[PDB]
Design an enzyme around this catalytic site. Structure first.
Site, PDB file in Angstrom:
ATOM      1  N   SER A 132      35.674  39.590  40.138  1.00 41.22           N
ATOM      2  CA  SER A 132      36.481  40.087  39.010  1.00 41.22           C
ATOM      3  C   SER A 132      36.991  38.926  38.147  1.00 41.22           C
ATOM      4  CB  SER A 132      37.521  41.037  39.520  1.00 41.22           C
ATOM      5  OG  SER A 132      37.850  41.969  38.462  1.00 41.22           O
ATOM      6  N   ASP A 193      30.777  50.257  39.122  1.00 37.56           N
ATOM      7  CA  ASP A 193      31.912  49.363  38.831  1.00 37.56           C
ATOM      8  C   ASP A 193      32.137  49.335  37.331  1.00 37.56           C
ATOM      9  OD1 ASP A 193      33.679  47.242  38.520  1.00 37.56           O
ATOM     10  OD2 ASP A 193      32.582  45.865  39.824  1.00 37.56           O
ATOM     11  N   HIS A 246      34.471  48.828  42.163  1.00 38.44           N
ATOM     12  CA  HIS A 246      34.892  47.478  41.844  1.00 38.44           C
ATOM     13  C   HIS A 246      35.538  46.787  43.019  1.00 38.44           C
ATOM     14  CE1 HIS A 246      35.899  44.043  39.424  1.00 38.44           C
ATOM     15  NE2 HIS A 246      37.194  44.171  39.658  1.00 38.44           N
TER      16      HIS A 246
END
Ligand SMILES: *[C@@H]1O[C@H](CO)[C@@H](O)[C@H](O)[C@H]1NC(C)=O
Length: 259
Positions: A132, A193, A246
């Site tokens: 991320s 995601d 995610h």
């Protein structure tokens, strides 16, 4: 694009995912082949990372944690494109403005610690990873390192679009992205995601790298190698924001230490 990767590659992606997801919990249970070095930290941006060394595979690994604080979330939301002045040779390159602040806020630590390790182990490769926000930190870091070192590798997980097309094309050249057989940039995504869809492309953002799209149930045979310009793999799924896909890569949730 193409169904299936090798077990050796799958293991490598799993290893880097583990390091990335462990960065949310003080590097719990990372592989025993890794020596933990110095912590990377800045108080204004709350960027957290470490330098690591794996003598068995002769690599110096730099990992960044992703979003773990309100401060990080603020960075995530600054979508203003900023010239990547770190790399003057990256012609017309611009990056996500928040992640550029992140990068600047730790640059001196990253460069000095990497330099220290690389001076002592000049034959070792340099690998950068994260998830991320940590994935975009890794991309900007790996861009910088690629200008001054050989054998730089980048493994990202749930990476946002880190910059503009100029930046993506620079990375594609520097990391040999023109074939999956040569790529040194593994941009790993998972199911739907939503983070790999942000910032939206139409704001002047682009991905680089070869995309390795993990479909559930996760495995080598259910991971896809995605190249070229069609909307496909993760980005085609239209996930919205930070979602379950995610948080969990190859069955490992950020910070959970279940591995
Ligand atoms: C977004 O980041 C850039 C640097 O990349 C900075 O100059 C700009 O002021 C930031 N925007 C906000 C609202 O803080």
């Amino acid at each position: 694009s193409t169904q299936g990767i090798s077990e050796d590659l799958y293991n490598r992606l799993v290893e880097m995912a583990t390091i990335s997801q462990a960065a949310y919990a003080d590097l719990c249970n990372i592989p025993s082949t890794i020596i933990k070095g110095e912590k990377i930290y800045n108080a204004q941006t709350d960027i957290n990372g470490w330098i690591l060394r794996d003598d068995t595979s002769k690599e110096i690994i730099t990992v960044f944690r992703g979003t773990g604080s309100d401060t990080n979330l603020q960075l995530d939301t600054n979508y203003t494109l900023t010239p990547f002045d770190t790399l003057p040779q990256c012609n017309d390159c611009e990056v996500h403005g928040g992640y550029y602040i992140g990068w600047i806020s730790v640059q001196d630590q990253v460069e000095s610690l990497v330099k220290q390790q690389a001076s002592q182990y000049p034959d070792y490769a340099l690998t950068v990873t994260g998830h991320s926000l940590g994935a975009s930190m890794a991309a900007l870091t790996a861009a910088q390192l690629s200008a001054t070192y050989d054998n730089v590798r980048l493994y990202t997980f749930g990476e946002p679009r880190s910059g503009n097309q100029a930046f993506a094309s620079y990375m594609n050249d520097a990391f040999q992205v023109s074939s999956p057989e040569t790529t040194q940039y593994f941009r790993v995504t998972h199911s739907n995601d939503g983070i790999p869809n942000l910032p939206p492309a139409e704001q002047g953002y682009a991905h680089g790298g070869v995309e390795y799209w993990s479909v559930d149930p996760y495995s080598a045979q259910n991971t896809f190698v995605c190249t070229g310009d069609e909307v496909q793999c993760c980005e085609a799924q239209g996930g919205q924001g930070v979602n379950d896909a995610h948080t969990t890569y190859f069955g490992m949730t950020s910070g959970a230490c279940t591995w």
